[PDB]
């Protein structure tokens, strides 16, 4: 979201998703330990 507030700042996507999870009130280790499952679920969702 930094590009909506000012200059564009790069950031790895996994870290961005960790930020979002922290946003909704969930620790990061959940994401960093289930990355593969989350990715597969997202891909299947877009396919559907």
């Amino acid at each position: 979201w930094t590009f909506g507030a000012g200059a564009a700042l790069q950031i790895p996507f996994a870290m961005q998703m960790a930020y979002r999870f922290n946003g909704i009130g969930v620790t990061q280790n959940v994401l960093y330990e289930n990355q593969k499952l989350i990715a597969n679920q997202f891909n299947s969702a877009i396919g559907k």
Binding site: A14, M15, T27, Q28, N29, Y32, E33, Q35
Partner: protein
């Protein structure tokens, strides 16, 4: 993340960055480095699951007190 003794340490709030030789933990919206110690990170799990984990050490604030405590 970061691996010290088989346990992955994550930042309480902020990100890990390296200038080229050392790693630091800094707040996200402003650059001010801080030495990484047990008061910035919390342990969770082990080192065999995370992707892209790194292999730097972590300081412990209580160690110097023990040395002085042993001294006297």
């Amino acid at each position: 993340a970061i691996c010290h003794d088989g346990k992955a340490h994550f930042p309480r709030e902020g990100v890990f960055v390296s200038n080229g030789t050392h790693w630091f933990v800094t707040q996200r919206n402003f650059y001010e480095p801080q030495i990484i110690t047990t008061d910035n990170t919390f342990v969770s799990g082990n080192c065999d699951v995370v992707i892209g984990i790194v292999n730097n050490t972590v300081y412990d604030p209580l160690q110097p007190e023990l040395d002085s405590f042993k001294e006297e």
